[PDB]
Amino acid sequence: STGSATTTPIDSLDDAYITPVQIGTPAQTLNLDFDTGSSDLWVFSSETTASEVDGQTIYTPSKSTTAKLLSGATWSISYGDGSSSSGDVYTDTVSVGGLTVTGQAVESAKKVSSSFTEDSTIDGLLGLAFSTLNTVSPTQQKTFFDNAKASLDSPVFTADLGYHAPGTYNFGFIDTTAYTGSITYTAVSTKQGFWEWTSTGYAVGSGTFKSTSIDGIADTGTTLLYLPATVVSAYWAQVSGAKSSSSVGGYVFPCSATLPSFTFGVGSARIVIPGDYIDFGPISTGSSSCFGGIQSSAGIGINIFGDVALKAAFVVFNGATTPTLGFASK
Ligand SMILES: NCc1ccc(C(F)(F)F)cc1
């Protein structure tokens, strides 16, 4: 079997992408953020503290005939930006784009951080990293992808994120009309539970390609591209007037500047990120300083190939017994 679902930016800057997901019987449709950097499926629910909910659609397990409380199970998660949420666990039926899994763990948020509360467009997260990162205790739970794997035609899913436009998440097949050229596959390490891979180098604008190994993760749940300080400094040095700002918390640049592209290596292939993808607009309404889409990973401890990078490519998440990541131009 297969599934296919459209994913849509939540705002004009592509800060995140939401995909409709059907939970329960009869279906309750929630807009979830598909996150290849985490492994929990959690949703705002009828159990979320009422002051912590500001316009989100909530999952109501009492109205689902297929929902079963997973007795004793709890979950607690903290993201790399300091966001947090926690609660109890139901199992229910979950469908994405026609692909249905029965008995999927659905983690009902009793408490959510203020970050999620103030984002009315995101009803929850659907984690697509490896199940070793799932936070359910004492019985760790499997991701949606892991539960769907056996019934999928191929154990893959693909991310085709759009630039200021809708895109597609496909499960179980590779749409050969969605990319140009060939797909370049590269090895994945699962040792930290992420889709972790090694980029073969980079180039700034039309400069020479620097061959150098950049270890990092493929993370649809992270907006920006976080790379080592040396790479980020070489990028921003090509933008007139760019500087790292302590009060803003990263590199900013004059909104009047035009940005060079950024190229990253995948084995022998090259993925080019257009300079327009790196513009995240004014740091405040009316400001002439704009925020950069490429920032240093120094404070984070891991390099993150977020949406800025992934939306320049067609990306295959191959969950075969030896997992790989495939990249193609599009
Ligand atoms: N989008 C999920 C996510 C967020 C942060 C991290 C960090 F910071 F731990 F690398 C990993 C994964």
Curated annotation (Swiss-Prot):
The active site is at D35, S199. Disulfide bonds join C255-C290. It catalyses: Hydrolysis of proteins with specificity similar to that of pepsin A, prefers hydrophobic residues at P1 and P1', but does not cleave 14-Ala-|-Leu-15 in the B chain of insulin or Z-Glu-Tyr. Clots milk. Residues 17-328 form the Peptidase A1 domain. GO terms for biological process: proteolysis. GO terms for molecular function: aspartic-type endopeptidase activity. Keywords: Aspartyl protease, Disulfide bond, Hydrolase, Protease, Signal, Zymogen. Its EC number is 3.4.23.22. Belongs to the peptidase A1 family. This is Endothiapepsin. It comes from Cryphonectria parasitica. The lineage of its organism: Eukaryota, Fungi, Dikarya, Ascomycota, Pezizomycotina.
